[PDB]
């Protein structure tokens, strides 16, 4: 019958990156190739393709650290 | 100390290169890399140099053939 919860979830970080220099970086990539063939796509239902999906990336943040919390609840009955 | 020459020389060929039909010819490279770090060169007498020469070819004549006849002489003394 009765109910009662308590939910306190503290969180505490001090999540440092500490860097001093990064200096010479590169990215040099060669291009290659690519080549598909397909004759039908029925695509359905929370897709996230990629064909042909060349792709030369740099992604150098100066100081980085994704953080997640993922908190959730539920008493339905 | 007389001298009496005779060069005739005759050449005859039929050099044929049929073909009926070339049809589905491709060529499909992806780009390497290359790279180089030298510091002094001094090239001379009939070079022919080829540095990071990347390169792709396609050499493709429909019927093909070369021919040479390279001839000389000499009677100098």
Do not use: A, M
Request: proline share 4%; with cysteine.
């Amino acid at each position: 019958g009765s109910v009662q919860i308590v939910y306190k979830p503290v969180d505490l970080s001090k999540v440092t990156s500490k860097c001093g220099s990064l200096g010479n970086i590169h990215h040099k990539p060669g291009g290659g190739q690519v080549e598909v063939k397909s004759e039908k796509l029925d695509f359905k239902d929370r897709v996230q393709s990629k064909i042909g999906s060349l792709d030369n990336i740099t992604h150098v943040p100066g100081g980085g650290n994704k953080k997640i919390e993922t908190h959730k609840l539920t008493f339905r009955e």
